[PDB]
Amino acid sequence: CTIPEQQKVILIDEIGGYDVIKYEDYPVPSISEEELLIKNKYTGVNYIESYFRKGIYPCEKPYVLGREASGTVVAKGKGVTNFEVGDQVAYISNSTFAQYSKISSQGPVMKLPKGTSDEELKLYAAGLLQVLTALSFTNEAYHVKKGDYVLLFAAAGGVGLILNQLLKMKGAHTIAVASTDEKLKIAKEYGAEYLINASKEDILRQVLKFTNGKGVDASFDSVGKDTFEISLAALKRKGVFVSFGNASGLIPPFSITRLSPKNITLVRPQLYGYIADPEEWKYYSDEFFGLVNSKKLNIKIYKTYPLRDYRTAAADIESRKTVGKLVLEIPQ
Amino acid sequence: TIPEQQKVILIDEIGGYDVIKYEDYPVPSISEEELLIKNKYTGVNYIESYFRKGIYPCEKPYVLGREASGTVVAKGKGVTNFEVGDQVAYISNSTFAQYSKISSQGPVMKLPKGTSDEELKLYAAGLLQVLTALSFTNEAYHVKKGDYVLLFAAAGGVGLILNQLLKMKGAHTIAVASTDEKLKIAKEYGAEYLINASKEDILRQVLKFTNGKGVDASFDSVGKDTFEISLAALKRKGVFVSFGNASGLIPPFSITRLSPKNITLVRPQLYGYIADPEEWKYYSDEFFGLVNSKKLNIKIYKTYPLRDYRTAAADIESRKTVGKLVLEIPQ
């Protein structure tokens, strides 16, 4: 493959509104002996980019957006032996809102079979973050068992949609909580056994009703501050509280002795801490491949936008009324 | 026959060792599912100091004691799992007494009729500490073979059992204590690595022993002053087990601090692990097997007559004391 020196990327030079988002000429990164150069086809949109653009989170400018992507290896370093030029890949790296990105061949990159379709590649880019999070959280944060009653908040959200399917597959009884009946409809479609409307119903009361007053074996809570007391009270004796996501960062300081009456285990995990080791990446990405390739797991996509039209995607996600993953497509 | 009055240790008010009273008190009556137990020995726990100082509230007069061994002298008409004359080890109320009671369905276990008086002392001395250490290393954090485990208060009651269990399980204990004498006893009880907290940088030594990787788990009962050390000493995905009274004095915790290393936090207490009859049976049987066989040794400090708990209270509140304090009940 002929590697160009200049490419097109989505980047921000300054903090501000949607007008600061630039589709601009940028260098193609050079790769080391151990690295892959990847020509991108699809890349997932995360809400965190809005925080960088608005200046809520700091970042060095110019900042090229994007972390999760799928595409084709167009070049590799001299020391790369686990990948070939032409291989289709899904990966987590830097600056993926781009025609070309780079990653270590030893890093979080997974090989995909020859002849993987563009639609399948879209699914991998859309599902990378959410599925690996859902797998690791249900394997290590709390190991979900058959027969478990599991409380699930934000059931129609990105991770929530995967959790609905995974908990069903593990033979667990999912109690899904969502803000609207419309979101609960989707939760049920994705495998939820019980449904609670957060706006209309007493959550704790319904959880106890479904669990016969015993409570849940675990709570996967990404709502945070508003549901912290509910999750804690809803848990069975010796139950496990899995708090996660941006909203869980809003939970006020907590006296740890409150975990004592019911011997509650508390975890606030993040994805990267479960895929830090090459052995850990291999394990979870192999499981992720198994679920998507076999078509046992559905990856819901809200809409696909051209890379240069990220401004529209940014406006869409910030409305907070989207259901399903927002994906960017890079024309080849 | 059973007498109407008995000798007990009680507190009428909050204060120093002067509020501890050796007084005449009614022998309790028992209902249809209860056992009346004539105590032979009872273990001294630091919790009685917390009631006396006013740290924990209690209705006064308050008869002290929760951990005892003795013989069933009476039972309710519905009791079928115990007989009059059975030797027992149990957890209940008001055990600093000649006579105490418990539900036959509560935390009480039958002992063999061949049980000696020396064994009765051992069971009363070890009951709470062993059950705590067993359940904490089984459910709070399930210790695996090859684990590196940080242990604070290593020469304390629970600490000395933890040293033994961690060694038994093939784990590698890093023991922390205030003096060299305390670390010495910890080592003899199963500790592998020793850190003097008065003399050494704890975190620096832990990272040295684990080759910079940290510990798989921390069992920390020191609380506020070691919370930062425990969190930093833990490996990625490690488990923080905070326990005991010192956990209450830890400032309110921002849970986002668990995220950089995906740390699991548990603040367990014994009774949440023995709430079910099946759970009590599991751990109490484990306790008996280990202590009766001498696979777990119960380090004793001294034995006192019930009337002399005043001295025992001063001894346990003194730091230089290592080992369980036991009270001998007048027969």
CB atoms within 10 A of CB A265: 25
Cα separation of A132 and B143, whole Å?
Answer: 27
Q: Are residues B171 and B259 in the same domain?
A: yes
**Residue A131 near residue A291 (C-beta atoms within 8 A):** yes
Cα nearest neighbour of B261 on chain A: A273
> Nearest-CA neighbor of A155 among A188, A201, A202, A200?
A188
Q: What six digits make up the tokens of A140?
A: 């290590």
Kindly report the backbone phi and psi dihedral angles of residue B28, in degrees, each rounded to the nearest multiple of 5, phi listed first: -65, 150
CB atoms within 10 A of CB A48: 13
Q: Are residues A193 and A234 in the same domain?
A: yes
Examine residue A331 and say whether the peptide bond preceding it is cis (omega within 30 degrees of 0). no
For residue B249, the one-letter residue type is L
Q: Are residues A21 and A111 in the same domain?
A: yes
Q: Are strands B5-11 and B62-63 parallel, antiparallel or unpaired?
A: antiparallel
For residue B238, the one-letter residue type is G
Kindly report the backbone phi and psi dihedral angles of residue A41, in degrees, each rounded to the nearest multiple of 5, phi listed first: -115, -40
**Final residue before a domain boundary, out of B273, B289, B316:** B273
Q: Are residues A260 and A318 in the same domain?
A: no
Contacts B266 to A, Cβ<8 Å: 259, 263-266
- Name residues 204-243 of chain A within 8 A of B (Cβ): 237-238, 243
Q: Which of A238, A268, A276 minimises the CB distance to B255?
A: A268
Cα separation of A85 and A76, whole Å?
Answer: 7
Number of domains in chain B: 2
Q: Are residues A122 and A36 in the same domain?
A: yes
Q: Are residues A156 and A230 in the same domain?
A: yes
Q: Are residues B267 and B313 in the same domain?
A: no
A18 touches B at CB < 8 Å = no
Q: Are residues B248 and B287 in the same domain?
A: no
**3-state DSSP helix/strand/coil percent for chain B, to nearest 5?**
35, 30, 40
Cα separation of B285 and B130, whole Å?
Answer: 11
The residues, any chain, with a CB within 8 Å of residue A44's CB and separated by 6 or more, are: A66, A67, A68, A69, A125, A126, A128, A129, A325, A326, A327, A328
Examine residue A62 and say whether the peptide bond preceding it is cis (omega within 30 degrees of 0). yes
Structural domain of A67: 1-129+275-332
Half-sphere exposure of B103 (CA within 13 A, CB side): 4
Cα separation of A42 and A326, whole Å?
Answer: 11
> Nearest-CA neighbor of A169 among A291, A325, A292, A293?
A291
Residue B29 bridge partners (DSSP): none
Q: Are residues A237 and A169 in the same domain?
A: yes
For residue B4, the one-letter residue type is E
Helices A181-189 and A158-169, packing angle to 10 deg: 40
- Name residues 291-320 of chain B within 8 A of A (Cβ): none
Helices A118-136 and A158-169, packing angle to 10 deg: 70
Here the CATH number for the domain that contains residue A135 is 3.40.50.720
The residues, any chain, with a CB within 8 Å of residue B256's CB and separated by 6 or more, are: A248, A249, A268
Q: Are strands A325-329 and A173-178 parallel, antiparallel or unpaired?
A: unpaired
Cα nearest neighbour of B139 on chain A: A238
For residue A274, the one-letter residue type is Y
The secondary structure element, H or E, covering residue A288 is helix A278-293
**Final residue before a domain boundary, out of A239, A256, A274:** A274
3-state class of B90 per DSSP?
strand
